[PDB]
C-alpha cells in the first residue's frame, strides 16, 4: 500500500533501498593520485581504523589486488609501488609480480 | 644516485632489493667488482700435470706469493 505519493525517493522505500557509498581509495589509486591517495586514505580511515593492524593488512591486500590487476599498464604499477611504500610494508611482492 | 652512477616510473618498477639509501649503489659496486674480478679470473686460469706442478714449485717464494690466480 503506497499511500504517500512516492517518487524516486519514497521515504519507506528509500529506507528499503538506502545504499550510500564514499569515494574509496580506489578512486585515487585507479586514477593514480599517490600522495593524495595515501593522505585521503588516512583522512577517511586512519582515525576510522579501529583495528589499525587488521585494517592495514586489509588495505595491503587490496593494494596487492589492484596492482596485480594492471600488469601491462605502467602508471598503475608505479602507483601501486608508491602506495605500498607509503603504506609501511614490503616492496618486493608487487615488484616481483 | 642513479644519475650519478650513470655519470620515476623510470625506476620505481625496477628490481633492486630495496629502495633504501645505500643498497642501490652497494649492489652496483658489488656486481661490478664480482664481474671485474671473474673476468680476469677466467682470463688468468685459461692459461704434464706433475711436471707443471714441479716446475711451478721451483721458483722463488716471493715470486710464488704473487701467483695471479692466488692474487
Swiss-Prot record, chain A:
Outcome recorded upon mutating residue 34 to L: In SPG11; uncertain significance
Expression by tissue: Expressed in all structures of brain, with a high expression in cerebellum. Expressed in cortical projection neurons.
UniProt subcellular location: Cytoplasm, Cytosol; Nucleus; Cell projection, Axon; Cell projection, Dendrite
Highest taxon of the lineage: Eukaryota
Subunit composition and interactions: Interacts with AP5Z1, AP5B1, AP5S1 and ZFYVE26.
Job description of the protein: May play a role in neurite plasticity by maintaining cytoskeleton stability and regulating synaptic vesicle transport.
The protein's name: Spatacsin
Species of origin: Homo sapiens (Human)
Swiss-Prot record, chain B:
Subcellular localization, as worded in the UniProt entry: Cytoplasm, Cytoskeleton, Microtubule organizing center, Centrosome; Midbody
Known tissue expression: Strongest expression in the adrenal gland, bone marrow, adult brain, fetal brain, lung, placenta, prostate, skeletal muscle, testis, thymus, and retina. Intermediate levels are detected in other structures, including the spinal cord.
Function recorded in the entry: Phosphatidylinositol 3-phosphate-binding protein required for the abscission step in cytokinesis: recruited to the midbody during cytokinesis and acts as a regulator of abscission. May also be required for efficient homologous recombination DNA double-strand break repair.
UniProt subunit comment: Interacts with AP5Z1, AP5B1, AP5S1 and SPG11. Interacts with TTC19 and KIF13A.
Disease implicated: Spastic paraplegia 15, autosomal recessive: A form of spastic paraplegia, a neurodegenerative disorder characterized by a slow, gradual, progressive weakness and spasticity of the lower limbs. Rate of progression and the severity of symptoms are quite variable. Initial symptoms may include difficulty with balance, weakness and stiffness in the legs, muscle spasms, and dragging the toes when walking. In some forms of the disorder, bladder symptoms (such as incontinence) may appear, or the weakness and stiffness may spread to other parts of the body.
Domain writeup: The FYVE-type zinc finger mediates binding to phosphatidylinositol 3-phosphate and recruitment to the midbody during cytokinesis.
Protein name per the record: Zinc finger FYVE domain-containing protein 26
Organism from which the protein derives: Homo sapiens
Gene: ZFYVE26
Interval of the full protein contained in this chain: 1036 to 1129 of 2539
Amino acid at each position: 500500500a503506497w499511500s504517500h505519493l512516492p517518487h524516486f525517493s519514497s521515504p519507506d522505500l528509500v529506507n528499503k533501498y538506502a545504499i550510500v557509498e564514499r569515494l574509496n581509495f580506489a578512486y585515487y589509486l585507479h586514477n593514480g593520485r599517490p600522495s593524495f591517495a595515501f593522505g585521503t586514505f588516512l583522512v577517511q580511515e586512519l582515525i576510522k581504523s579501529k583495528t589499525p593492524k587488521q585494517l592495514i593488512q586489509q588495505v595491503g591486500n587490496e593494494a596487492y589486488v589492484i596492482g596485480l590487476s594492471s600488469f601491462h599498464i605502467p602508471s598503475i604499477g608505479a602507483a601501486c609501488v608508491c602506495f605500498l611504500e607509503l603504506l609501511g610494508l614490503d616492496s618486493l611482492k608487487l615488484r616481483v609480480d | 644516485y642513479l644519475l650519478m652512477s650513470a655519470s620515476i616510473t623510470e625506476l620505481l618498477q625496477m628490481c633492486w632489493p630495496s629502495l633504501s639509501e645505500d643498497c642501490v649503489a652497494s649492489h652496483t659496486t658489488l656486481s661490478q667488482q664480482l664481474d671485474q674480478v671473474l673476468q680476469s679470473l677466467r682470463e688468468a686460469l685459461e692459461l704434464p700435470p706433475l711436471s707443471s706442478l714441479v716446475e711451478q714449485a721451483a721458483q722463488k717464494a716471493p715470486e710464488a706469493e704473487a701467483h695471479p690466480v692466488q692474487i
